Design a protein around this ligand. Sequence first.
Ligand SMILES: [Mg+2]
Ligand SMILES: [Mg+2]
Ligand SMILES: [Mg+2]
Ligand SMILES: [Mg+2]
Ligand SMILES: [Mg+2]
Ligand SMILES: [Mg+2]
Ligand SMILES: [Mg+2]
Ligand SMILES: [Mg+2]
Ligand SMILES: [Mg+2]
Ligand SMILES: [Mg+2]
Ligand SMILES: [Mg+2]
Lengths: 143, 206, 60, 62, 262
Amino acid sequence: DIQTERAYQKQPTIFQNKKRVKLPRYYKNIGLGFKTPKEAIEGTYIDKKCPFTGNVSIRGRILSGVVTKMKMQRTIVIRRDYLHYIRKYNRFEKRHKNMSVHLSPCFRDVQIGDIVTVGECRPLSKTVRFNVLKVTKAAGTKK
Amino acid sequence: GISRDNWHKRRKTGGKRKPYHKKRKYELGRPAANTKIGPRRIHTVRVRGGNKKYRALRLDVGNFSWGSECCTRKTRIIDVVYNASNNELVRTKTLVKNCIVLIDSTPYRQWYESHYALPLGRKKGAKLTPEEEEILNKKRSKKIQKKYDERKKNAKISSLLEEQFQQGKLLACIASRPGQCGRADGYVLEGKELEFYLRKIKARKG
Amino acid sequence: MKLNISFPATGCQKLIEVDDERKLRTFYEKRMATEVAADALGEEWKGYVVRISGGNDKQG
Amino acid sequence: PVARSWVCRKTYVTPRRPFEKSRLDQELKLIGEYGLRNKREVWRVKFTLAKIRKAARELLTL
Amino acid sequence: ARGPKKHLKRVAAPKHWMLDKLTGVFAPRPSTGPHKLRECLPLIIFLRNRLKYALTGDEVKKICMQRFIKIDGKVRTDITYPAGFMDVISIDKTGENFRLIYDTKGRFAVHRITPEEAKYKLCKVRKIFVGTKGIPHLVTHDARTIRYPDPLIKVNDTIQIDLETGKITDFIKFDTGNLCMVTGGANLGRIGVITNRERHPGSFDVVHVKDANGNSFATRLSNIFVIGKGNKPWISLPRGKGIRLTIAEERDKRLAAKQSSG
RNA sequence: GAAACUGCGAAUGGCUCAUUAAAUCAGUUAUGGUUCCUUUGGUCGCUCGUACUUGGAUAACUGUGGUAAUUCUAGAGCUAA
RNA sequence: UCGCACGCCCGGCGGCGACGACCCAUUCGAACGUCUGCCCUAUCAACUUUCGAUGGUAGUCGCCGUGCCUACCAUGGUGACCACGGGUGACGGGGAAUCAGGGUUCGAUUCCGGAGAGGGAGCCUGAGAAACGGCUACCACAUCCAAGGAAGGCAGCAGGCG
Ligand SMILES: [Mg+2]
Ligand SMILES: [Mg+2]
Ligand SMILES: [Mg+2]
Ligand SMILES: [Mg+2]
Ligand SMILES: [Mg+2]
Ligand SMILES: [Mg+2]
Ligand SMILES: [Mg+2]
Ligand SMILES: [Mg+2]
Ligand SMILES: [Mg+2]
Ligand SMILES: [Mg+2]
Ligand SMILES: [Mg+2]
């Protein structure tokens, strides 16, 4: 379950040792009409870099990419696609950018190949600057 | 000098970025504080913007909070027992943020016995002849004895904490950054966090 | 070795052209800012105690 | 950095073919009729004509 | 640049100062102050190039340090002081009071007013702060951080300030129907009623403004300065009254004026 | 009012294109992730425990000097913030 | 602390300014980031990686965010949509020249941003410098001398050599 690291993994704000005689979870809404998910409230994970249950603000840009690799832990790689217009030829090129985004463990079942909305935040690592804000499934793939 | 650069290291792709400028001053690093336990010695460092930082080097006392009953006291630090960062920071006794120290429980025992008038610690058989605990525990008026009686139903403590009080020293976790701010402030470990770190220290002993 | 001797209680100072090593062995090999008996440079000077307050080298 | 303009413009233009006989005869007739001193002062008036005419063409395309 | 820059080239100056290309390499760098670098008009530009009370910067210095000019009810003695929007620059010997508003174009205008109008001016509130003992603070566009304001005055409104006490008198809430000056952008100097408010979470919000003669136009909030309740301002408006009639209408109104004058 | 101490500037400007190929740079945004002399506006009896003004240096000044030589400086006396 | 006028209670209250300072806005900024964009080369097709490469955790440092650095774990990250490597007689851009429409070449250079003061490195002071008409060295070059030492940096304006 939880507490698999060296230090105690706890949400900083809520104080869990008030005397009695279950644990209250900290969550928020990130805004922009993004509805905070159900697993972020009934969840038992803690996360420093979760957009809903952590100390990150979603601010600036709102992008959307396509999940290609989910091998990094608590973060994944999305693949953005776009058509670039050269002006000599009146045509397009298919280019792409691979950015690494932080995938909170509230979005539980995510497979490769589904369009994911990400949101700009503070720089979370060397190459991570975006959190996953909502997930929609692929074409079909409801099985 | 010692620097904090994104330009000195490789790209996301693994390629080498060639530098276009020198080491600027604002991309600055400094040697670590490596704060030890001893009679206090704080150096000030001149900072960007004309500010100052207080590096502890030796640091004997710190302001620790007992969060369940809300009393923080200046308390002397005796040992560092755990560090999630590194074991050599336990070995060479080093105070950082989120390192786990032992502090003597005597000011918290004084506050608890002043507030509730019940013995805490106190391996029974010993009794203090200098009568200070006696005038602490006794001599209440009839109007205020029911006030202390109303308090002493909310005066029960955890058994792990009571073991640490009978030991005379309790576990705290530091939350201030002593190389940055100067202090060794922190909080007494309680409950699930407490038994988590007690399980870690027991696993370290073996 | 020129010697610039100053007396502060009268505030009067004078350079004296001592060139005698048997006069100067009493000031030799001592560290700065010590009080030395000055009877060696002259029989006329006796009971004068003097602080060695540092000078200038032969290259200035 | 100095405080001066550097905005300048050629007022004339040279023709593409340098020795076209009918162009030479037509320009010589014009400068002889109107008393001119060289051919840059007929080339500049033809160039100002060309700028006005291309402005007119660009407005007619609007 | 290893620090703060202190000059400004004549070419790189903001254009609504209307400084000539040829007479200088440098433009006067505005000192730091209650207005931004490109939003303000320097007092040397206000005296020398436009009023022509002075001829050169030395005469500007002499005017400014005989302690004559009194901007926002206080005398400033530096040549390059930033005098920005809605500022009251007063001259006591000529008895002449000037209020700084953009005209129909983007530039500032010499705008003579009365002393009864010069006793006050108007300010857009930028932010409401709460201070160190629960003390409400209101911050204007010219950094006038008067505290304990009226608790109905909120973020994007305007207030009227009596300058001698330096204190609020009345206010206009940012609401539809009120007049507004467009203090920035491409609509710089227009006057019209606020007809629509379009919210955008995250990005900047815009406002549709319908002028005196029907021509509506959109502008984001940061460039908008409300100037009075309803269809009437609380200040005196300049010549043109904030329309930006087209270039054809400007052309035939100057042509008919020259034809009628002769 | 020379000098000298103190405060401020000297990090702007001027020159050049060697480096540097998602780097610099352009448009666009964010700092809810920070620092900011100065300017302007706020606050500057909020604390509950010799002031009718406290201390002693030091430069300029004076007077001995050293060095082939420098915007090199030593020792002795004074005297302010 | 400093300067102008100098008053009024019955020794005490007083006007107008200067200077100085915790913090807060504001200004001039700065610095890190977000998205998109650049010339040639495959006789450059795999590169990065416990000597940080990609993340997670917890810290150190820094003004702050962040492998920036350290410890412990995970084995990732980019690439045929041209990565990586190499070249450039490559500072980028606003723009310039030629031009029907297309484009082609140039942009050392008066505006903006960058970088740099022979080469690299290190740092004091200061709000702001890794500053060079500031120091500290080392390399190269070079000035004076009594041979012990001292002083230097025109890719600023002139000018000289090459
Ligand atoms: Mg084409
Ligand atoms: Mg410069
Ligand atoms: Mg080259
Ligand atoms: Mg080059
Ligand atoms: Mg160029
Ligand atoms: Mg070149
Ligand atoms: Mg430099
Ligand atoms: Mg050279
Ligand atoms: Mg310089
Ligand atoms: Mg340097
Ligand atoms: Mg020089």
